[PDB]
Amino acid sequence: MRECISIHVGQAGVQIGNACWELYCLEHGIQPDGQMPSDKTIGGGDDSFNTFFSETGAGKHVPRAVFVDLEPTVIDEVRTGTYRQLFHPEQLITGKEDAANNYARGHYTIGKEIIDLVLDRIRKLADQCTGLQGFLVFHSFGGGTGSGFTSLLMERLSVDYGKKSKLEFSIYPAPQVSTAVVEPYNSILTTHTTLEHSDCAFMVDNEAIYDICRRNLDIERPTYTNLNRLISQIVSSITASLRFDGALNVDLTEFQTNLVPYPRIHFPLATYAPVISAEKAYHEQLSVAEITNACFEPANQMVKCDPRHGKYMACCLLYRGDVVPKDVNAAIATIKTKRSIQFVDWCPTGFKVGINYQPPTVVPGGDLAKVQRAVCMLSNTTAIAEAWARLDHKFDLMYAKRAFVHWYVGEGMEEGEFSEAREDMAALEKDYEEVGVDSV
Amino acid sequence: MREIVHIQAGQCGNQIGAKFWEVISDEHGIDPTGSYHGDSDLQLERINVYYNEAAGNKYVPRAILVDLEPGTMDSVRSGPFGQIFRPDNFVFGQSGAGNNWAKGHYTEGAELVDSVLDVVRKESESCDCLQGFQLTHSLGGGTGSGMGTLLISKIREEYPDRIMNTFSVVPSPKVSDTVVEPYNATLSVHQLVENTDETYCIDNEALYDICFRTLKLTTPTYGDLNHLVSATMSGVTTCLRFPGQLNADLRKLAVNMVPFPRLHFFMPGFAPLTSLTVPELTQQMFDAKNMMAACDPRHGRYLTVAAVFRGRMSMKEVDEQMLNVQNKNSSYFVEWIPNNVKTAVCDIPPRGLKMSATFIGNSTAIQELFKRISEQFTAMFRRKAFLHWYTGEGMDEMEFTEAESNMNDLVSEYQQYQDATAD
Amino acid sequence: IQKAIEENNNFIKMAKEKLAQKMESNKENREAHLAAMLERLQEKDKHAEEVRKNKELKEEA
Numbered sequence A: 001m002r003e004c005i006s007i008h009v010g011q012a013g014v015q016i017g018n019a020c021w022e023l024y025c026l027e028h029g030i031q032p033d034g035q036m037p038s039d040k041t042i043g044g045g046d047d048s049f050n051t052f053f054s055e056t057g058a059g060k061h062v063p064r065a066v067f068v069d070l071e072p073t074v075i076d077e078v079r080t081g082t083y084r085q086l087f088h089p090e091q092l093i094t095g096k097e098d099a100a101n102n103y104a105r106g107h108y109t110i111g112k113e114i115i116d117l118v119l120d121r122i123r124k125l126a127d128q129c130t131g132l133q134g135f136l137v138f139h140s141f142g143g144g145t146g147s148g149f150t151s152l153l154m155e156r157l158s159v160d161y162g163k164k165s166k167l168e169f170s171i172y173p174a175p176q177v178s179t180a181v182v183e184p185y186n187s188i189l190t191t192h193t194t195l196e197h198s199d200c201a202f203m204v205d206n207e208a209i210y211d212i213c214r215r216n217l218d219i220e221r222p223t224y225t226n227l228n229r230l231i232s233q234i235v236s237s238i239t240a241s242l243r244f245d246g247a248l249n250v251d252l253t254e255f256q257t258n259l260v261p262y263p264r265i266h267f268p269l270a271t272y273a274p275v276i277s278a279e280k281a282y283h284e285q286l287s288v289a290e291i292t293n294a295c296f297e298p299a300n301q302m303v304k305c306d307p308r309h310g311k312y313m314a315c316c317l318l319y320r321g322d323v324v325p326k327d328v329n330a331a332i333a334t335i336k337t338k339r340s341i342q343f344v345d346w347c348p349t350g351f352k353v354g355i356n357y358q359p360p361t362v363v364p365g366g367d368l369a370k371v372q373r374a375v376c377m378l379s380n381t382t383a384i385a386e387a388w389a390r391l392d393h394k395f396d397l398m399y400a401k402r403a404f405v406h407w408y409v410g411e412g413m414e415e416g417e418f419s420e421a422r423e424d425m426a427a428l429e430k431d432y433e434e435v436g437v438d439s440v
Numbered sequence B: 001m002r003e004i005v006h007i008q009a010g011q012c013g014n015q016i017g018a019k020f021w022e023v024i025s026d027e028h029g030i031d032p033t034g035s036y037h038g039d040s041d042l043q044l045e046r047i048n049v050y051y052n053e054a055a056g057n058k059y060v061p062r063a064i065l066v067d068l069e070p071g072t073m074d075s076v077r078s079g080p081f082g083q084i085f086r087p088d089n090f091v092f093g094q095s096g097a098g099n100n101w102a103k104g105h106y107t108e109g110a111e112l113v114d115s116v117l118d119v120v121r122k123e124s125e126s127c128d129c130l131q132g133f134q135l136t137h138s139l140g141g142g143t144g145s146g147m148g149t150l151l152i153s154k155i156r157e158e159y160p161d162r163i164m165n166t167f168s169v170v171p172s173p174k175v176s177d178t179v180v181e182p183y184n185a186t187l188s189v190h191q192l193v194e195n196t197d198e199t200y201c202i203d204n205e206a207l208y209d210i211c212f213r214t215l216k217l218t219t220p221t222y223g224d225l226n227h228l229v230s231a232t233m234s235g236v237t238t239c240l241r242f243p244g245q246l247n248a249d250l251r252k253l254a255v256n257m258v259p260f261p262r263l264h265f266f267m268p269g270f271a272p273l274t275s276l277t278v279p280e281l282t283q284q285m286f287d288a289k290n291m292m293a294a295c296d297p298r299h300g301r302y303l304t305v306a307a308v309f310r311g312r313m314s315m316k317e318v319d320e321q322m323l324n325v326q327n328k329n330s331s332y333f334v335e336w337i338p339n340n341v342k343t344a345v346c347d348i349p350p351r352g353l354k355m356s357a358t359f360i361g362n363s364t365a366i367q368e369l370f371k372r373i374s375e376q377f378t379a380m381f382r383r384k385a386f387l388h389w390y391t392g393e394g395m396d397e398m399e400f401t402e403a404e405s406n407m408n409d410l411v412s413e414y415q416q417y418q419d420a421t422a423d
Numbered sequence C: 001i002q003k004a005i006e007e008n009n010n011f012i013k014m015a016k017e018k019l020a021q022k023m024e025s026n027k028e029n030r031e032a033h034l035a036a037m038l039e040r041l042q043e044k045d046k047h048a049e050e051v052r053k054n055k056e057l058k059e060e061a
């Protein structure tokens, strides 16, 4: 009970959804045919994993997920892939023409033609829920679908489910694997339009994941598969509290209370450790203190920024595996006396800790090593605004010449929406400056 | 399921078009009869983009062949892969246009255009999701230039929300002796500036200089020139024909390449040109000597660029080298378009080469090309020479002035953003 | 609890309205951008109709 509906929008969302659900199945002992031998409650149950999987009379466990893309080639691989049987066909929704990296096409022109069907299929999942908690929306900032249609969906979900919670996993654009020159435009437009409709958004910088793969896994040129398999690990750590339950397990919502002081300030910085190859892990067990140390090395963050040059508003540690409170408290004591951790004056400096005993799983043939214990730190730091600034600057360089703007106006958008969105980002950057100033 | 409809008009259009189909047919494993005999399943994954599927597992190019003269229609019919085309897709005139833009655009072509639109419409009516059209034609002749720009205008009337692409061959004294070619070219650009989304400027001046100086071919033939054009066209379409994330859609490419609607005239490039290491391909590909448009990129600035590498190669090396040429040539990329250089790698090597590279550039140095045509044009308009050829077809001489001014406006606009700064 | 309900409804109210205001304004603009483009091409055909008429007038001289 208190189920979560995942929504995967665009190529990035869908492919990351493939990585997450594959990982979920392995963590829960669910087979590609949806069967789970260990589940003795056939066709139902109120187990912890039932927050993410529904059950059929035939014993199949079905992700509470919807995949949506405006073109079929990406979802088609799901329809024919290893886990094709996991999803009921109606869970996989495809258009025929993509948004061509144009926010307007995803939000208006092409999006309007499929939005009703998507909501109807999302409604068919909510009707199977006894106490639906909220939504997890996986999408990219950069794509036309991931930015424009997502905004439309978030807008329409706030209407059909009032203030029921909606969480984002957003792919922040990075030049190394970027696809378009207009992504700064689409990133600003979608951030402006979803800001009022998202309760918490976890940003993932592809450059950060790109660097981590090359440095920590000695992958010379990471692919989307490399990045997604790492991203799934982080997503798993965040959602593990919802899918497993235990004596030290802390619900995501409880962390969420500490991470959002003001509604607009809902962008936590995620850091994950250990990311280590199986060749290096061999005969080198990482202790609780070692992985906790890594949470404060910026090289391990999901978003490139410097917490050292900002102020903390919250600090959460989500351990999974062989971890006990003592080792955690010991490590934190060392960290607090040895690292730069300065909080705003208006909030407590404690660290909120949660532990899941189920240990991390690795997908066969992956690059990560299986470890006894892992940790994901969620921190509300003002440094996250650096990601807005970098993007806002790139937006400003092009918009000053109205470069590429005609492609959006041609689809029905007005220059006003560009300046309206940029102004919102200006406030957001000024909001992050305000929260970090001392009191008088 | 994202189909492109191909059109070739005039001699030049029909001949480079036929050669284009020869090359890609080989790359996909399609023999002159339309039967597949290939080694890889990736050849067929996106074959639909340019081919229809037929009874008996045969593949038919989605191409229509147009000309105001029947000579070329027999020539195409009897050449290699001649019988692969759909016989109803030959729309041929009887008389020709005598290298007169007005005849192709206003009178003789107007009689034949309707019959052309019928075959365009039917190829379009059987498309799962049509993305747009690509036209091959010269801008110096009469049929391809005038009628082609007319056909573009009529197609955009019936498919206004679809992409219009052209491979437009720009005329040069070094190849064609005809004298009024500068008139036809300027009139064509006047139309292409308004009704096309992407124009690949295939410059005969550059193709000649390449054949003579680099390939060391004294007295080059049209076959020598087209050999270069087919290599370029195969490279531009590699992203469309094979599964590659980057520019896989005509408009997704246009969105990434066209920062302002009127400045959609690209410099194509190819490497290697001979008859190789990743560093050498890249800096060769960025050389003035390797451009298919007679322009020096170092006399301007780059708005947007697309590099396409084909073959088996170290992508870490490709990334390193593409990132290196930008730091070393940072003055020639506009600073107000961040990350304006994109790179695609296609695992498929081309024919006869282990590694190749195709270059697509939207550079403000393209003005050097348009200034040349404006120079050839004005030299005649100041003497009102040969105008009777056009006034006889109903045209008014101030329509020439409009074309001239609109092209001179286009040049100034390229200079407008070449001199622009950030702060 | 009345106030909590009141503010949830206004959020749904203003959300749907603003959305409906954009989807309509968006349809107006794209329609007008196409309408103007088709207007232009039709003006080229009219200019094409006259030119062909201007040719037959000079054949009678």
Ligand SMILES: Nc1nc2c(ncn2[C@@H]2O[C@H](COP(=O)(O)OP(=O)(O)OP(=O)(O)O)[C@@H](O)[C@H]2O)c(=O)[nH]1
Pocket (backbone or CB within 6 Å): A009, A010, A011, A012, A013, A015, A016, A069, A070, A098, A099, A100, A101, A102, A140, A141, A142, A143, A144, A145, A146, A147, A171, A172, A173, A174, A177, A178, A179, A180, A183, A206, A224, A225, A227, A228
């Ligand atoms: N981490 C990760 N990011 C991706 C992946 N695919 C796309 N992205 C991000 O998304 C951007 C490209 O847009 P896409 O998401 O592929 O396109 P889309 O969302 O389907 O929207 P359209 O294709 O334009 O219709 C890139 O710049 C990336 O930052 C992926 O597989 N993994």
Ligand SMILES: Nc1nc2c(ncn2[C@@H]2O[C@H](COP(=O)(O)OP(=O)(O)OP(=O)(O)O)[C@@H](O)[C@H]2O)c(=O)[nH]1
Pocket (backbone or CB within 6 Å): B009, B010, B011, B012, B013, B015, B016, B067, B068, B069, B096, B097, B098, B099, B100, B138, B139, B140, B141, B142, B143, B144, B145, B169, B170, B171, B172, B175, B176, B181, B204, B207, B222, B223, B225, B226
């Ligand atoms: N590179 C290349 N250019 C060609 C070839 N054939 C024709 N051209 C170019 O085509 C232009 C002349 O126009 P045509 O090829 O005769 O096409 P057209 O419009 O049908 O001409 P007409 O029917 O006689 O009015 C010149 O600029 C030539 O350079 C060719 O085989 N290779």
Ligand SMILES: [Ca+2]
Pocket (backbone or CB within 6 Å): A039, A040, A041, A042, A043, A044, A045, A047, A055
């Ligand atoms: Ca059960």
Ligand SMILES: [Ca+2]
Pocket (backbone or CB within 6 Å): B175, B220, B221, B222
């Ligand atoms: Ca010749």
Ligand SMILES: [Cl-]
Pocket (backbone or CB within 6 Å): B160, B161, B162, B163, B251
């Ligand atoms: Cl379009």
Ligand SMILES: [Mg+2]
Pocket (backbone or CB within 6 Å): A010, A011, A071, A098, A099, A143, A145
């Ligand atoms: Mg897509």
Ligand SMILES: [Mg+2]
Pocket (backbone or CB within 6 Å): B010, B011, B069, B096, B097, B141, B143
């Ligand atoms: Mg001819």
